[PDB]
Specification:
About 40% of the residues lie in helices and about 25% in strands. It has about 170 residues and is α+β, with helices and mostly antiparallel strands. The chain has a single domain (about 5-165), classed as 2-Layer Sandwich (PX Domain). The protein is elongated, with a radius of gyration of 22 Å. It is found in: Endosome; Early endosome; Early endosome membrane; Cell membrane. GO terms for molecular function: cadherin binding; D1 dopamine receptor binding; dynactin binding; phosphatidylinositol binding; phosphatidylinositol-3,5-bisphosphate binding; phosphatidylinositol-4-phosphate binding; phosphatidylinositol-5-phosphate binding.
């Protein structure tokens, strides 16, 4: 519990995408840093869940259900219809309806952020699953901690003796 604390402090709704800031505070020796944040989308959560489900060792374990898919269709439909009718409304009527629209966006955000956040928090509190290496990668993988492995061989007789590849 206290050893690995995860939250989603903010999220972004775009026309074609929803992004979550995943923020971690940890004392665990395994992590590069004690505090860090990454950006993740729903499909990354689904990947993590699928990976844990397919892990043989975790048979007989209760895996936290995957988050629900983010759906901003409702608010975005109302946003369009409100735009169509802007000419037919007073300043005060329009602003009221913009308030209700923003209240609906807020309710959707609240529900989907909680769904994604709880999933990670349940993993963080599981004595076994909190150690999973894919879970670790989900939380901290970033351009800043990319590592590269360099290899070289002697030549004879085709220069072309070196290899580079990213490693986790």
């Amino acid at each position: 519990d206290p050893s690995l604390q995860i939250d989603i402090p903010d999220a972004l709704s775009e026309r074609d995408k929803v992004k979550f800031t995943v923020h971690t505070k940890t004392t665990l020796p395994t992590f590069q840093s004690p505090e860090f944040s990454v950006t993740r989308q729903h499909e990354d959560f689904v990947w993590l869940h699928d990976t844990l489900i397919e892990t043989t060792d975790y048979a007989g374990l209760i895996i936290p259900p995957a988050p629900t898919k983010p759906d901003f269709d409702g608010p975005r439909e109302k946003m369009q219809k409100l735009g169509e009718g802007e000419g037919s409304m007073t300043k005060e009527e329009f602003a009221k309806m913009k308030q209700e629209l923003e209240a609906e966006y807020l309710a959707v955000f609240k529900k989907t952020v909680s769904s994604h956040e709880v999933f990670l928090q349940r993993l963080s509190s599981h004595p076994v699953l909190s150690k999973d290496r894919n879970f670790h990668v989900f939380l901290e993988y970033d351009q800043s901690n990319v590592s590269y492995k360099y290899s070289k061989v002697n030549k004879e007789e085709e220069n072309e003796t070196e290899w580079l590849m990213e490693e986790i």
